[PDB]
């Protein structure tokens, strides 16, 4: 018999290997003077929870619905209760089986209500800019088609269907569909209709699309200018007027504009453009660049640039992937502020919107087709559909869509075929199709490494080692000779590097040497711009970012998710403040004299006239001398010496020795510009003189020993432990010496290579390093300065179970004003567990004091926190800030908040001041323990006390980028090793 | 300066390497009729967190002592409120630094005021029979001296000390000393005095010590007796008397007893002695027995002996180490009632009152020696004690008292050196010492496999592979010749094998066929008798055990501790049920043809007049005849064909085909034993008449169609899922294909060997397992009879991000009355993750009802649960539990409870019945998800939600022993393939 189960039909339509139906021609997303009328706002929407439930119902009438509640559109739809988001990075949270779908697969039903006049007859379409994932569109109750591409465009025309005045748009929305299986991107899934719906007239005589081509000649100075517009896919006549320019063409014909000023980032020149015909105009905004590849270079108007980029994906932490206008303006503002010039589009178009204006506040763009099929990798690329022909017209189609959106934006300088799709026939295809439609863009595409239908060569998160040899062309060839002499007249760009996740990231440094040097590398794009926190309410009313698991998933992948240089809200995190220094492009270096600096413009086009070049000394009371240095204008590439005012070097020689002092010349915006005010900061450079070493108080004040207790001077010392129990009067619950601390998210990562592959925090664990017990050997009192004496505790450090340990001895030292300690660390038997090396965290103390630090200041780096491989932003200078704001609000909690390179501190722990000085040192100080720190999933699971852990570090290892990419590099790893140090110590009441 | 730490004297002894100081000469426990004073009772207690603390504040004479509070002695402290059992397996719970102790040491010290009369002077001694680990003993202010060894005697003369009236005895306890390092059973640390503390006069011209020597000349039959009795170590005059023998000697003299009735663990003949000077007389339980290792093979008077044995730790789950007499007895009791005749006293030496015991009921003991070592094997042995001269008094002083105290007792036929001790001098020194101070018992140690030392060749889980090897004589050699040729002459014996953890153990069967059949095989020990669960009360009121971390431990090893055939309650497991089966001295073969049965008499010494021999024919309507036949004894190791009574014959004969039937054979005790009453089930066998393969039934009903169900005689089903949602009114929330269980502790430890040594849970885990989908393919009627149809549902099962899948066709059949069920699995792709295998855990369906099942009744295997490698005690018949009892009540949940071999169920959901027939199933019924089944901790994680899951398996997998030893054996895996299997359904309300 028969087939008797239900949704046959539906489910035969999202299995479908077919592009949408019922569509108009791909075309340029374009600025017009036809009528036209959003229609977001407040829809009404239906979920099912999968097809063989969906009602047919006749609900496309909109008459008698039952089960629809409001919701706003555009919208992820997840985010406003209607299911929940789900994370997962790399597996698909479905059954591997293309083109089917599971079973559980919700269905949404939108539905909106709208009046149309009479300009939108008799001709008017119908625009979708995004519907995940698969869309079918009904007016009417006439069905008009599909969608699919969920970041593509869509339109329809509704000629003949919309009729004047009352209209019912209806629109079936499947979260899953064949297309998932091509929309595997690291990010939520989330389905909806989450960008614009409008309604657009097209009257007569008519422009539907038009290709800006406007090309620039270095040599001549010549703007080079063709603009092709068409209707129904057929040139016509149409006037182009650039005012600015004094240019009068026609449409379809190539000129050459005597004299154009270049687009580029740095100097983003746009001329404002009209295309019109009869009976309609387009506004553009033309940007005169030509891109070329030349002697294994990536130019840009003749010259070789260098990117300074971030991945951008498009999310809202309570929007899902609608992003505000305003969100988008301020983001982008805040990349120009750290000093990024590139955006990938990671890895999907963006919001049409998007691109004017990247080409208004100037970034260099790598535009990606939404294509991504990661979860085949594990099967070893089987079923992949970017080799499957029956994939290839849905494929061809996605790379369709995405070029003839975006054709016109001189930002974009690179086309990308996708992310990680393995290699295939349909990616070659979607190669073939674009460089015969737009050749004025290099080709970019990372998953097919022999780089055979690319133009440029890419990889991800190759080492430090990796591309120091690429950028000499020295790296391996491939087997096929062809192919590797292609490849090799290649530049190279990593796409995704210093992946961002959490304390980190480090290895920054040693990239951008490379990036300098070697005119092959075109730089990179740091994986990535922002963490994906989706935002969580608690009983309390207490906010904080969730990430994968925590609405549910049964598969996930955590907080891989929460992976970016700024929070979802857009906060920076520290990474970003080091990420500006590293990439900053003016170089200044502060002679060691403080006679001058030298400045090395690093700029590809621009001089620096639109710098203010500024200098202050300050001190410890403060500012001493301050001002303004005139910069004759340095080319783009050059370097000059630039003279400092003699009163700043004169201060120098005056300074008494171990005065510390700081000099600091930095360059600002000499005006506004677009993305920052004046005086906004861009480059820096600084020479210090450093404070004398710690002076080690006179021995001059005696033990007094008693029952229980110890005294010398100011410290008590509990006679059973040999540990200070007060000094000064503040209470110390507790001092030790630490190797270990919370694991970040790159400890949590594999380091791959050698026989072990465990996690450094797995590593730690096996090695009882978090577990750390301490046993007293002795206590004893020695001879020290006119009859006083020096306490010395002898103690060993060890883990249960474990037959390695150091040796420690805490050498008391007092003159009853200041105290001197110096700690002696020694290994007693081999670091050796699991037959692999243990590597410590750190060489540290830890003290525990029974009361609360409302204050911390040091002189050292700073303001924000610094480890051994990153910490480049922070300065050298006088900080202080209140405790809560040492922290750095990880949605993970983990190890953060150290400052390296410290040479003095002061907790205010209310009315009494604590202070330390020694060599350089690492401070953190925090008011919960770091086994609060490392159990916490959360930020609520952070609690206060009552106490401060204050921890003083001789040594720190690095934080690498494990999680994805490099460890920590050789220079920062922290082996065992023996060490002494010395500290000294007073309670200013 | 001088020293100034607390606590330096206490400590230095605490790292001492000598033995105890002070005691009296290590003897025999005796039973004497000196007067003798028990001192348990209630104590006064102090705490101490460690010895630098611990006060010094003459709190030994009992006046005016703050702190302390009533706890009873003997105790382990931590069972009664006082810091906390922790558990630990091979890990120490301390730094690794010998001798040295941390810093967290409970100090715990006891005093009790006890009242001496003149009976007890001049002369008389302080018996202290266990402290854990480190005891200081005073008695009225005097220090008598320090003991160490936890598990072994130590007296103290108080001549002189003791004074008449009043006295006051302090004892001063470590948790910790140097003796923990040797010390390390995988057990719970309990520090406390655990045994009993005695007050005994020892009158002038009395015993001290006493030497048994009963040898049995099997072939005379004479008893070869010397009774040594010394006094201050020097031999004395004293009178041996044996009643029963009319026997009147000299002690210290050898002699011949011309027909003595030898003692083994079958027979345990013992014969009352007493040995008698001028003041003091002694009371002997003498077995005669002589033991030799001849062919290699273990002999014990003349021949050659199977050991069917357990490893008895003593712990009580609410006692600790302190185990009731009442316990002790019964639980020996219901060793002898699973047929186990061997004890092997894991790791250290039991309560001196057991021996007495073993001797009586019968039991071959391996006595050990406490020592253990464990946690120095993950640091390649360095600093082993076993190896370290410094040790050698230590440990030659612990075997010394081992030996003495339990010398004289026919029950221990072997002295073991330890466990998991490594190899090194002291250990050939403890053995050098046995080897001359009593030659008369064979000596073990597995620890050093070469056998230096030993008289046994000894391993602990040697594959059933190995064992088969062994047995043959055919291992590998040594590499020196000389040694080799030693342990090839040694018969050999399991100390560990069969690890009893949870779900299991399998395996069993295959390693009792090698004993039987190859004589240098001894046989093997069970790890091990009893789970040392803890019991832990709940606010509710609910008691449960726990295990390690459940006591805030801060490393620890889980439910490993909880492993035995028994709970700590001494309430059977499964495999213990099983293990009586395996090890049943008697095989009873029944004749296919009921007319008699073949008998083996397995046992070494009795023949079988002490068994009635009972036949019973059971069919579904109850006993359809049974008797007793006589049964002419059968020799030790003889065979013979005993004719059953012809009714029973002519009763098979005369069976209508098809009709179910099963006739049993059971040897039980023809007499009440000193272990169990007449009729207790000893031995058993059955020839079963299976019932009629099922029916399908005729399809003669149709299918009604409808807008969104479907009905098919009583079933009705979804249209959108195509599974049934009711059947004869039930109704079926959710019904599957299942392929996984929650995993067992078996299925969570590593499969060594391959290059895949994750535990089979993990490879469960990411192979998607644990997470099935199901996705709807079809839904189709097709002709059936008569107008009536089948109905066929075609799904496919896999799992989220896999490609591997299985098709699953479910047709369905009604004649209206009986529902027929065809199932069929096809595999669609090959199943490999991570570049292996994936296995199955079964082959079955899920129905989930949703209604409560009262009880289950089935006929197939029982009463209790059967999987592929188990189930040897489940017996073939008809079954009724209480769904309460269906569950299997392990500590750790997990999968438990199968019913392998069902051909038919009965669940009773209240007023309605649910039928299942088919082919041989498995059977589970519980009331809540398999996911609630994993991921419970503990049986309170448990909870009942209302509805019924019943799982009928066509395939299970074995359980194998992979937690500690073998995993799944071959023959038992279960990989992917492909099957079809048929069943019958019916509701009889
Ligand atoms: O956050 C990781 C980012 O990097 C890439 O994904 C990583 C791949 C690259 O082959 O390596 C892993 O670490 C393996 O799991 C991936 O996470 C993606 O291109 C990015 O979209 C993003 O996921
Ligand atoms: O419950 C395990 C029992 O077996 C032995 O310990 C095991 C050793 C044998 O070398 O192998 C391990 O599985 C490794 O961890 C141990 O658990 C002990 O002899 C027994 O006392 C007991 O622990
Ligand atoms: O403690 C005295 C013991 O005497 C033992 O036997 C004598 C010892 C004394 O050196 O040496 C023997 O040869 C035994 O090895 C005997 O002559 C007793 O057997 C012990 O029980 C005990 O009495
Ligand atoms: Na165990």
Chains 1, 2 share one sequence.
């Not at 474990?802 to 009853?816: E, I």
């Amino acid at each position: 018999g028969r087939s008797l189960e239900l949704g046959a039909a539906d489910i035969q339509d999202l299995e479908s290997f077919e592009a949408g139906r019922g569509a108009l021609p791909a075309r340029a997303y374009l600025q017009s003077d036809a009528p036209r009328l959003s229609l977001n706002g407040e829809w009404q929407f239906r979920l099912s929870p999968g097809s063989r439930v969906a009602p047919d119902d006749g609900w496309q009438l909109g008459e008698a619905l039952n089960g629809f509640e409001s919701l706003p559109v555009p919208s992820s739809w997840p985010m406003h209760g209607h299911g929940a988001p789900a994370y997962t990075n790399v597996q698909f949270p479905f059954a591997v089986e293309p083109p089917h779908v599971p079973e559980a697969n919700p269905i949404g039903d939108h539905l909106v209500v709208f009046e149309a006049g009479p300009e939108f007859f008799p001709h008017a379409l119908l625009r979708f800019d995004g519907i995940e994932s698969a869309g079918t569109v009904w007016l009417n109750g006439v069905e008009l088609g599909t969608t699919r591409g969920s970041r593509l465009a869509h339109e329809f025309d509704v000629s003949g269907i919309l009729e004047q005045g009352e209209n019912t748009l209806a629109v079936r929305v499947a979260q899953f569909s064949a297309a998932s299986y091509v929309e595997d991107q690291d990010m939520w899934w989330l389905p909806g209709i989450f960008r614009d719906v409008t309604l657009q007239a097209r009257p007569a005589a008519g422009i539907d699309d038009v290709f800006v081509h406007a090309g620039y000649d270095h040599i001549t100075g010549e703007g080079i200018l063709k603009v092709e517009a068409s209707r129904g896919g057929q040139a016509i006549d149409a006037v182009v007027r650039v005012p600015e320019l004094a240019l009068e063409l026609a449409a379809g014909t190539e000129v050459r504009v005597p004299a154009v000023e270049p687009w580029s980032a740095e100097v983003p020149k746009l001329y404002e453009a009209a295309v019109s015909a009869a009976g309609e105009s387009v506004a553009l905004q033309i940007g005169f660049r030509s891109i070329a590849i030349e002697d294994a270079q990536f130019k840009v108007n003749g010259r070789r640039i260098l990117l300074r980029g971030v991945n951008r994906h498009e999310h809202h932490p309570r929007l899902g992937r609608v992003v505000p206008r305003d969100v988008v303006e301020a983001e982008l503002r805040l990349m120009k502020q750290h000093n990024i010039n590139a955006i990938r589009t990671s890895h999907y178009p963006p919001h049409p919107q998007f691109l004017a204006l990247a080409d208004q506040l100037g970034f260099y763009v790598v535009l990606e087709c939404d294509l991504e099929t990661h979860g085949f990798e594990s099967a070893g690329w089987a079923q992949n559909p970017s080799d499957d022909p029956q994939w290839e017209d849905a494929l061809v189609d996605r790379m369709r869509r995405t070029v003839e959106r975006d054709k016109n934006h001189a930002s974009v300088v690179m086309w990308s075929l996708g992310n990680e799709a393995g290699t295939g026939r349909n990616l070659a295809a979607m190669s073939r199709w674009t460089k015969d439609r737009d050749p004025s863009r290099p080709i970019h595409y990372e998953g097919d490494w022999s780089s055979e239908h690319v133009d440029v060569y890419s990889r991800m998160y190759a080492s430090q080692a990796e591309t120091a040899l690429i950028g000499q062309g020295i790296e391996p060839a491939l087997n096929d000779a062809a192919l590797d002499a292609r490849r090799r007249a290649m530049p190279f760009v990593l796409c995704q590097y210093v992946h961002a996740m959490g304390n980190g990231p480090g290895g920054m440094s040693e990239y951008q040497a490379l990036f300098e040097k070697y005119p092959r590398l075109m730089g990179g794009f740091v994986w990535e711009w922002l963490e994906h926190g989706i935002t969580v309410s608690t009983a309390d009313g207490v906010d904080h970012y969730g990430y994968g698991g925590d609405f549910g998933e049964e598969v996930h992948d955590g907080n891989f998710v929460t992976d970016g240089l700024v929070d979802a809200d857009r906060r920076p995190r520290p990474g970003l403040l080091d990420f500006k220094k590293v990439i900053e492009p003016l170089r200044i270096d502060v002679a060691r004299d403080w006679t001058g600096f030298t400045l090395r413009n690093g700029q590809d086009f621009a001089d620096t006239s639109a710098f203010s070049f500024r200098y202050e000394v300050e001190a410890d009371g403060g500012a001493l001398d301050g001002g303004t240095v005139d910069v004759a204008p340095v080319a783009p590439q050059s370097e000059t010496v630039v003279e400092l005012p003699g009163s700043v070097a004169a201060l120098a020689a005056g300074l008494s020795d171990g005065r510390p002092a700081v000099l600091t010349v930095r360059a600002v915006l000499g005006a506004d510009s677009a993305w920052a005010d004046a005086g906004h900061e861009v480059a820096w450079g600084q020479s210090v003189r450093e404070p004398g070493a710690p002076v080690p108080p006179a021995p001059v004040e005696p033990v007094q020993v008693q029952d229980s207790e110890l005294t010398l001077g100011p410290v008590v010392f509990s006679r059973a432990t040999g540990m200070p129990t007060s000094i000064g009067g503040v209470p110390v619950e507790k001092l030790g010496l630490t190797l270990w601390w919370a694991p970040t998210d790159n400890d949590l990562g594999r380091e791959w290579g050698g026989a072990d592959e465990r996690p450094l925090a797995t590593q730690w664990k096996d090695a009882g390093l978090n577990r750390l017990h301490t046993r007293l050997l002795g206590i004893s009192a020695n001879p020290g300065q006119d009859g006083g004496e020096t306490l010395t505790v002898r103690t060993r450090v060890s883990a249960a179970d474990k037959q390695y340990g150091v040796l420690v001895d805490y050498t008391w030292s007092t003159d009853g004003e200041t105290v001197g300690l110096r700690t002696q660390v020694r290994r007693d038997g081999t670091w050796v567990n699991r037959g692999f090396e243990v590597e410590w965290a750190r060489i540290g103390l830890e003290f525990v004091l029974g009361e609360e630090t409302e204050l911390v200041s040091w002189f050292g780096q700073g303001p924000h926190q610094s480890y051994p491989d990153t910490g480049q932003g922070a300065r050298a200078g006088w900080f202080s800030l209140p405790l809560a704001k040492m922290d750095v609000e990880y949605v993970r909690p983990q190890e953060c908040g150290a400052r390296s390179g410290s040479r003095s501190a002061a907790l205010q722990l209310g009315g009494r001041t604590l202070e330390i000085c020694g060599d350089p040192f690492a401070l953190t100080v925090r008011p919960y323990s770091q086994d609060v720190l490392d159990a916490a999933a959360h930020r609520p699971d952070l609690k206060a006390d009552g106490r401060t852990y204050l921890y003083v570090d001789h040594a720190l290892r690095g934080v690498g980028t494990a999680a994805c990419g490099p460890g920590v590099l050789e220079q920062y790893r922290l082996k065992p090793r023996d060490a002494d140090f010395i500290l000294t110590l007073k309670v200013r009441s």
